[PDB]
Amino acid sequence: MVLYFIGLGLYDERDITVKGLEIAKKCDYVFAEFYTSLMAGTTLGRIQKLIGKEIRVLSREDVELNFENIVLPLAKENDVAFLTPGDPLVATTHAELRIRAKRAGVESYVIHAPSIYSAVGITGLHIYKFGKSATVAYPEGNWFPTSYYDVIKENAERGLHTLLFLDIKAEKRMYMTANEAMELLLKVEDMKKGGVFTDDTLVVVLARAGSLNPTIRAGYVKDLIREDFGDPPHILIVPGKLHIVEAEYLVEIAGAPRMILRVNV
Amino acid sequence: MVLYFIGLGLYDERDITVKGLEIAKKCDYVFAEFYTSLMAGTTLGRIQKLIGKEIRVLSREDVELNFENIVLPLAKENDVAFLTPGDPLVATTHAELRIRAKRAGVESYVIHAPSIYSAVGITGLHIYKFGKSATVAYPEGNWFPTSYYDVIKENAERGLHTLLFLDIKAEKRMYMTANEAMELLLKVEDMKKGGVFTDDTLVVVLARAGSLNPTIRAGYVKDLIREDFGDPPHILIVPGKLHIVEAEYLVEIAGAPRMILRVNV
Ligand SMILES: Nc1ncnc2c1ncn2[C@@H]1O[C@H](CSCC[C@H](N)C(=O)O)[C@@H](O)[C@H]1O
């Protein structure tokens, strides 16, 4: 009579940790959500096969409004698991579900899985150099989100890199590409005109991290804004001032233009 | 012709991903390094038995100075794995290892695993609010390094959280405790008197992340500085101003005093 929050990792069913798999195999009931991120290399069927259980998938409303009425009841009698893409507590509000579990008298445990937040290390950029992170959200109606632009500005003034989670509307099967996030940023730039994101800004794209062949590309917005980075999910990074070894990696591994090697210390 | 960078995850031998395990098993040769960190919840013997391969351990000098003479040669006609604690490439120097593989005409792929960078999401603190990260180093001889103190100050004045890695002598297996880190910081505060770390500063201590029973504690320095957080490894975090949901989690899950919901929000 326990609840496990188990991450499924970055790309496919095998990105689950061994810990997570052996525990999920022995749970009486398994629930999951696939709206906080997209695992482009697997299916519900392959996940069910691996864990050997029937997974019931919940929507954002099931989780946000009825988690305590749908999942918690069973965890009082049984050992229940709640699976999520990547790490369950990164760039989600699932941490709060722990609090609901405690007041329902249910003990909860967390099994981590690889997360996009640390997988950025594959870009060659020093992970300690990342500053505040932000989310590029799709505009809707007359509401046009722009706070993520200011995040970039603040980080870059400090010489820190900016990680940008891209929006996702899983019920619409919509996954924001790096391209779309660049276009949105250029628009915010025309408006605020702070010189923060232009045709000359160096960016880094990481798509489908976790796969054996993720797309890793670095370059100026003018040259990458229309490039095909493959299927989602995508993440966009606006680097701060680069260390030489960072630049060397972006060039050798991410095909960045030779000219970024000459940093302006 | 292939080199696999495989992460071992956070604490024990089950923290490797299913993908990482299966690939490691199909490799002709398996190397590991334990100089960037250790896997405090297991042993080399137990990891070897899980992988079903003898594992040759490499020292810092093995890697930094002779990676191309020890590892790359076998990867020319074999499948070779290089295991590292946490998520590969999060350690500042390992990304350039990929460049060496390239220069030697060797294919390389990265198999991710949970990292402390994402795992701290279990503290209930929003991942996006973390700013620049740093390492607390022991002073020694005539050298008193204090840059980590400066990192806290510039993150906190922007309302950002500071993730602090604590000094480790992997080879000697000596860990800096969160307690020592706190006293260190208090000493640096008395030196710089910038009002960044005092008895009244709120901190979060995460110990043995990855374990089913990690220690997560939150409170003021004056009450936590002599408390026993258990066995290493310890991670220290100095949160910036909290969102109410953050504070509620710290109170409900990490045993923080109610006081923070009116003092640090
Ligand atoms: N494998 C992957 N490759 C690239 N971006 C990814 C990714 N997985 C997640 N993301 C990014 O993160 C967003 C979801 S945010 C939720 C993240 C998740 N808890 C984790 O730990 O990874 C996506 O819209 C996308 O921009």
Buried b / exposed e along B162-182 (16+ C-beta atoms within 10 A): bbbbbebebeeeebbbbbbbb
SS3 B245: helix
Residue type, position B240, single letter: G
CA A176, CA A71: separation in Å to the nearest integer? 30
CA B104, CA A247: separation in Å to the nearest integer? 20
A81 is in an annotated binding site: no
Distances in whole angstroms, Cα of residue A193 to Cα of each of A101, A187, A236, A238, B263: 46, 9, 20, 17, 37
Nearest protein Cα to ligand 1, atom 12: A165
Using the Cβ of B122 and the Cβ atoms of chain A, whether some distance falls under 8 Å is answered with: yes
B138: enclosing H helix or E strand: none
Q: What is the resolution of this structure in A?
A: 2.2
Question: Phi then psi for B54, rounded to 5 degrees?
Answer: -65, 145
A122/B110 CB distance under 8 A: yes
Buried b / exposed e along B135-150 (16+ C-beta atoms within 10 A): bbbeeeeeeeebebbe
CA A109, CA A97: separation in Å to the nearest integer? 11
Among B17, B116, B118, B120, the mutation site with the greatest number of ligand 1 atoms within 8 A of its Cβ is B118
* Domain over A115-265 is classified CATH 3.20.20.70: no
> What is the residue extent of each domain of chain A?
1-114, 115-265
Residues from chain B that touch A81, judged by Cβ atoms under 8 A, are none
**Of 2.170.190.11, 3.40.1010.10, 3.30.70.3270, 3.40.50.300, which CATH number belongs to A1-114?**
3.40.1010.10
Helices of type H across B86-176:
96-103, 116-119, 147-156
A47 is in an annotated binding site: no
Atom of ligand 1 nearest to the CA of A90: 19
- Establish whether residue A166 lines the binding site of ligand 1, counting it when its CB lies within 6 angstroms of any ligand atom: yes
DSSP of B174-221: EE--HHHHHHHHHHHHHHH--SSS-TT-EEEEEESBTBSS-EEEEEEH
- Establish whether residue A36 lines the binding site of ligand 1, counting it when its CB lies within 6 angstroms of any ligand atom: yes
Question: Phi then psi for B179, rounded to 5 degrees?
Answer: -60, -50
- Establish whether residue A249 lines the binding site of ligand 1, counting it when its CB lies within 6 angstroms of any ligand atom: no
Residue with tokens 């519900």: A44
CA A16, CA A11: separation in Å to the nearest integer? 10
DSSP of chain A: -EEEEEE-BSSSGGGSBHHHHHHHHT-SEEEEE-SS---TT--HHHHHHHHTSPEEEE-HHHHHHHHHHHTHHHHTTSEEEEEESB-TTSSSSTHHHHHHHHHTT-EEEEE----HHHHGGGGSS-GGGB---EEEPPPBTTB---HHHHHHHHHHHTT-BEEEEEPEEGGGTEE--HHHHHHHHHHHHHHH--SSS-TT-EEEEEESBTBSS-EEEEEEHHHHTT----SSPEEEEE--SPPHHHHHHHHHHH---GGGGS---
Please name the member of A21, A154, A252 whose beta carbon is closest to the beta carbon of B18. Answer: A21
A116 is in an annotated binding site: yes
- CA–centroid distance, B76 to ligand 1, in Å, is 33
Using the Cβ of A121 and the Cβ atoms of chain B, whether some distance falls under 8 Å is answered with: yes
Using the Cβ of B85 and the Cβ atoms of chain A, whether some distance falls under 8 Å is answered with: no
For residue A22, give every residue at least 6 positions away whose Cβ sits within 8 Å of its Cβ, in sequence order, or none: B14
Residue with tokens 């009082």: A76
- CA–centroid distance, A165 to ligand 1, in Å, is 7
CA B79, CA B6: separation in Å to the nearest integer? 13
